[PDB]
Amino acid sequence: KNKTLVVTTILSNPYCMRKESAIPLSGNDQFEGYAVDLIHEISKSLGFNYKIQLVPDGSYGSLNKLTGEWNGMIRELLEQRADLAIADLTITFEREQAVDFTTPFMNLGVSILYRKGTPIESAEDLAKQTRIKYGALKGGSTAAFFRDSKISTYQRMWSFMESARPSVFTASNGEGVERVAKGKGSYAFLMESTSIEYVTERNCELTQVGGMLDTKSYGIATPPNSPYRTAINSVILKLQEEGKLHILKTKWWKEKRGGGKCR
């Protein structure tokens, strides 16, 4: 009951955002968002206290094959500096070899963020040209999807992205969004559908292009042999069945920070 867990997370709209505040904030009070609410609900049900700490390297977690070393939130778990990672963190085979994910709390797939009203209607339309540049978050699961694909269209896109100069990869979703929004049609961003929907609810000149290219989920990551994973799974399923995960999705995707006004 007096247990205090360290939660690693990452700034990504609307999962975890700095509050809009002209006065100084500190601690957990600095942050809000879907993931902040989710960990609050989990901590209440299971009766622990927690400290939110942004991952110092601003990375989700990738594996360097040369060194065999992880970075990002995954590394914070493996090095025992965090007890839980709660974010838009994709459950991947590769990460699950190193850490243990909970059952999912959100489903998604890779898609395309671009401006509205253009001839680009699909990934095929992007891969077939070079006028519009396109990229993805560096080191994330979207980039890995393209890198590891054996579909010709996605192999062609990966080759284009790896070869492009200056880099088409971004350090964050937010950077990708800004590059689309201010790019005057010269850039499209490969982005997770959930994260796209937050943007398109608020920037009425942007849209998701095409459908989802794969299917995947976010889950809470825990270190190997964590004594909390199983209890958290029950909380997630309870919140799911009670409808509270959907309420939190509506709150952050349609209501907070000017959502839902694109006519």
Ligand X SMILES: N[C@@H](CCC(=O)O)C(=O)O
Residues making up the annotated binding site for L-glutamate are 88, 90, 95, 141-142, 192
Binding segment for Na ion (CB under 5 A), chosen from 61-69, 76-84, 93-101, 103-111, is 93-101
Instruction: Supply 23's token pair.
Output: 């006065």
33 vs 140 by CB, closer to ligand X: 140
* Cβ 118 to ligand X shortest distance, Å: 22
Distance CA 212, CA 184 (A): 24
Report the site for ligand X in 95-154 (rule: CB under 6 A): 137, 140-142
Binding segment for a second copy (CB under 8 A), chosen from 79-87, 125-133, 145-153, 156-164, is 145-153
52 vs 89 by CB, closer to ligand X: 89
The count of residues in the chain is: 263
Q: CB atoms < 10 A from the CB of 60, how many?
A: 24
Interface residue with a second copy among 2, 24, 241, 263 (CB under 8 A) is: 241
Alpha helices in the chain (DSSP H): 34-46, 72-78, 93-96, 123-127, 141-148, 152-163, 173-181, 193-200, 229-241, 244-250
Distance CA 222, CA 96 (A): 10
* Cβ 193 to a second copy shortest distance, Å: 13
| Residue 9 CB partners (closer than 8 Å, separation 6+) | 15, 16, 31, 35, 36, 52, 53, 54, 55, 73, 85, 86, 87
Q: Which residues bind Na ion (CB under 5 A)?
A: 96, 100
Q: Which residues contribute to the site for a second copy (CB under 8 A)? A: 91-93, 96-97, 101, 103-104, 107, 145, 148, 151, 214-217, 219, 233-234, 237-238, 240-241, 243, 245-246
